[model samples]
Target: LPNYTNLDLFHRAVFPFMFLAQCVAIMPLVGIRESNPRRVRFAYKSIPMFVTLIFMIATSILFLSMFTHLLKIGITAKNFVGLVFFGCVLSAYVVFIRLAKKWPAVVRIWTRTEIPFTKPPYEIPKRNLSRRVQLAALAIIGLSLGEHALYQVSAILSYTRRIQMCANITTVPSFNNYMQTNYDYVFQLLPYSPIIAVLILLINGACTFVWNYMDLFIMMISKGLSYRFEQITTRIRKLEHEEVCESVFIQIREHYVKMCELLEFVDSAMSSLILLSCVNNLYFVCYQLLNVFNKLRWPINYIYFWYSLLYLIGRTAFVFLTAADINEESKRGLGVLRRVSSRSWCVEVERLIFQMTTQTVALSGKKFYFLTRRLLFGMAGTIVTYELVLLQFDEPNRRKGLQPLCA
Candidate 1:
């Protein structure tokens, strides 16, 4: 039996997650209208938009309530920074859904581009990619769900501590009492009861999950494009030992450029998300790193803080490095081209070199910076520089004979 090229294979792995996201109003854009191994189609759905609007309204209330509660009580330096952190996250969440309208076009172009790659001469064998794709999908699933659980568990632990502290100060203490007594800057004000607590929990969980999904989606799409680049490069390496034809080089160049165009579109649609994710991660990473100098609250807080910090570092590093792979793979063909004999040199080879060199193909944050290995080193410097600046401001507080505050 022969198999047709499965352009929708990645969609199969991604659909379930996207469906769940839609149900929660995390992803309120396009849905697969129809899909088979050979092709996939997407369409906008009214329900998700309606669902998104409702959630957005509720979230806005929470946002206002948080700021109001903080202002009414008193904003400590820690509370102020925390407010900014949550503000950025909530903004990203809104932007994510706002941008979901663009995905249908992106998906359309992506599937169309896969057509040539799926043709006779360039078709990547199923065996070459299925295992890797499955493994990657599995890893994403684990990460998404695991991060969701991590946040929930941490919230529960924190709430429990809050209650314990409040119990010492008042009778019949509950989460509401904790919120009322301490003026905790949670999503919503505790006006009515625990039902409001349930509302806050739902909104919080959705935001946290979507925040993680933002990076994971980038990883997923980046891996998809990078794998195709890998296949192309691998084929070229195999050809290095065999006879090379100008036609073969021409086909490779055409397919490579088509892939590059697809990447350009992908980056265009998602760069805002990329920019927001980077900003969100950078602020938190700096915030957490600064907290290391301060004293820990409870023994449990120590574990939570370390776990959160390590997870943030790992996630940020993984996102940048995974995105960097596309640039690496795109340029890998240069090495193989350099090894070509003089007799085999042709306009296609030269043109391929020129195109690869001229166009710096990598994901960029709305033209701010490209995600490359060099950017990784630059980020390290950025973190260190900001950290020193923050420490200097914190110096006066430390000198005031007050205990240093934990993030």
Candidate 2:
């Protein structure tokens, strides 16, 4: 019969509920209630908030239960201190989610219209254009940077703790003496040192890349706003014929030109920032690449370096692709809006508006694709690297050590 402690019971009871709560929290964002707008609103407005509150309460109970459980298991005070570190990380994420919710309101307010249009307007307001782009950029860069920082710090700290635990373990005296006598065994283990060092270095490089990528994202947002404004201004110039009379068309054209100039100022500032950020990121990538090459010895270390390179390349490509897609979608939306305003054909205009709305919904107020792809790429690289390293470690001892370990 298996022994069951109070901790085991607590874990068993709480774990499933916690998972269920998490699932409930996640359902809101993954197209669960999308079919019914009312349901979607309810889910978004209430579900996550309720789930998080439940999670907080559950976490508190778990913390207390685990503390008592650990004490029953004879865990020392020194080990209990580590719980404080975990608390800090949990608190940070809680704060982050709270801040993230505010972004939606910011987006809505920034894009709000002074006067709702019955039909598509000839020109969009200048303040609306500038505010929308700025808010989008702020939301993306700020949230991404915060997430990256927290992830990197947590991973590094967790690994450090693992290394410390491993170092503190008491080896069997007979085995330790035997290993010390074997020169080959010592040499084999020496390779692991450089491999671990390279792994740490790669993590540091990734952190730096994330920071630089956020900066680049901000610049892209600025450039996008500027480009849109410039295009609008050019259209206005074309629309305004030699007629100087003050008409509704003239008013619309003037509004468009003003929006363009405001966007241009934003663009100029962002361009300078972009140039600086690009140079810094390039330098960091080069430096990390050089360091990896110089330190490359073991197969494991080589795997780490290559994986990091692939991750950086994939992320850079994704960012560029995302920006391009956004630009194309925005242009399509604008074109549809213009055609609708002309009132050439009601059916055609409605169809175009539908298309525009779909595209805008997909592109606007979200950074899902960019972040998701980057995460998948990174996780894939890490998994592949781990498998390769494990294989390399087992290759020489295939018959002896590998067979026994597998068995």
Candidate 3:
């Protein structure tokens, strides 16, 4: 017959109650309470208190269990393991809380405000890209997606195995005994698994959020570009339609021509900014993705990888859409500008359009090349540096309280 003791009762009864409390702590209230802003604020305020209560209860239980065992059976692996695991959890909480506190300052610096757009001499056309530039972009996307897929598949397998191992260990008596005897050894190897997983998830979430915001910015810029172009085109068309050769009409025509040139410059600047922003986003994603792979953190890493891949796809689709819009708008603007009676005004408009188109094409090509080289070279450098660090530091074990002189 199996031994049935009060210790087992305590484990079963206390654990369930603690878990219920944790569930309550983390759960959002449903119905009107969820929608009520005041209630939501109250709930948010209560979270730290609830979390602290849970932490205290857990710590008390852990220490009590350790003390009881030590008194009865003397110092053992199980006690040491529990203490180390507790320390790891506590350290993680401290580090994350500090990081969360510093986040606002970091975000402020990262997204420092600047003038929205600066005029460039020539406007770039979106329609023309060299075959090499197009191919390189496609290659980067393909490679990124391929790596992402592999990482996700592997992560799923790894997570499944971890879950299975946890279940198996919990159920087997002999295995459990062995675990208790060598608990510190087993735990020291695995304490950071949860922390690493959570960190990766956070990185993935942040990356997705930033990418979505970038898309919104692109949409806003595109709308402004199209509207500005249309306004200039309409003014030119109105001037052309007027039959009077009055001085006022001539002056109006000259003003409209100047406005068109200004609008062309604005359009080019927006396009350049959009392309540059896309390249910046891609560089960031690639850097993060490479970090994920090198860490071997599994599902969390995979999450970030796929999120980045989707971000790239979304960016590409947006670029194509913007390009199509530019082409259509250019045709409309050019048609209107051609109707003006003054030969000089028409020639100037044509020259402006030509310059804009050339500048846009050149800038797009440059952006594509710069992004590709950065992703490849930056990833390579990051990996080399990471490997060197690992080699030099001797891979700090997560559970060992090994605080080096520099660390």
Candidate 4:
């Protein structure tokens, strides 16, 4: 009953596993493996749990889809799901989990992600909007992502249901044996289907949250920098009003130090990985857009188009937009430093701006390539380029296989 394009199990197995594996690799790569602050020791454990649980949930789904059958239930499927669900929950009691086990030895890796703290200079800040705005944005993003994931699982279920209900069940080949083998074995999956769907939604939500948390690392740095720049401007203005030239230089110099710490962490260690993600996102977004466009004529499944499109655009596009904002805010801080008049200070703050201008945070993959607003423009160009080729050259043989998801 799950025969959508014959349920290409290989692609399903390979891609999700690879993505999940990467998710694990990401834990050691950019995850909050270690935080120096004593207050953040919880992070070493919590971060891995989040990261692992995301993969665990996705892997659980893989096991579920692979095991569960439309023709009839299988003991292996039930046992596997049980092992994934409760068996592991109980195992956690004695597993001597790796997070606390590795302690400082493991956390030395993973990514940069975040939400903006300071409003861009190009945009005016509203006093009414405070930290609450940031919290709201996170909340909105969380809800939006959770909704999209649930919708995805539901769309898949919808397809399964259509096949199951299209006609009476029959014995069919899935793996090693034929389904619907015994009359006594033939059964309906719809009885506890509601529970199954809820379970799937939960699993999907967990994985999605892990992804968002990874993104938060970069966003926090970007927003924090913006916030720092805002603070620097305020401090500089106060110093100028107080007629303390050295104080202005000291404050601006301090800003560069903090900026350097953040920039170095991202540009030095994270650029390459982020750049790879940028390229990956571009390819996935392109395919997702085309898939959505092509499916627009379909029924209930079509709702998935907008759901998926919105999620991908929001997740990938917003990061670059935030990065561009940081780049602008960084430039604005430079201007603020240069505008200091000949009131009192020496050339102390002159080269400070130069330091920032050189080690610029333009959001690139190391030295591989630059990520800017233009990346989105380039994404559009790539999609159009790919679409023209597909329509003109491959339309006759459009039976080619495609991956399951965009990133």
Candidate 2 residues lying further than 4 Å off, grouped into runs, are 1-46, 49-99, 114-234, 240-290, 297-307, 310-407
TM-scores for all predictions: 0.86, 0.30, 0.33, 0.58
How many clashing residue pairs appear in each of the predictions shown? 0, 0, 6, 22
Candidate ranking under lDDT, highest first, comes to 1, 4, 3, 2
What TM-score does prediction 2 earn?
0.30
Q: Please give the TM-score that candidate 4 achieves against the real structure.
A: 0.58
True-vs-predicted CA distance for residue 314, candidate 1, Å = 1.3
- Candidate 1 vs 2: which has more lDDT: 1
- lDDT tens readout by residue for model 2, 148-168: 555444444434443345546
Better of 2 and 4 by lDDT: 4
Clashes of 4: 22
Tens digit of lDDT per residue, candidate 3, span 1-407? 21222211112222222223223231212111221111211233455446644554444444454555555557643245444434333333333233323323322221121001111211222421222233334444454445556654555554444544553433333333333333323333334354544433333322233233334334433433443344434444555665434453344335434434443443333444445455554544444433332333445555655665565555655544553354345455556545645633544555645543543321132234321233435645754675555443432332343233222
On a 0 to 100 scale, what is the lDDT of residue 199 in model 2? 39
The lDDT for every candidate, in the order shown, is: 0.71, 0.38, 0.39, 0.45
Our tally of clashes for model 2 stands at 0
Which consecutive 10 residues in model 1 have the weakest lDDT in total?
34-43
**Can you give the lDDT of residue 71 in candidate 4?**
25
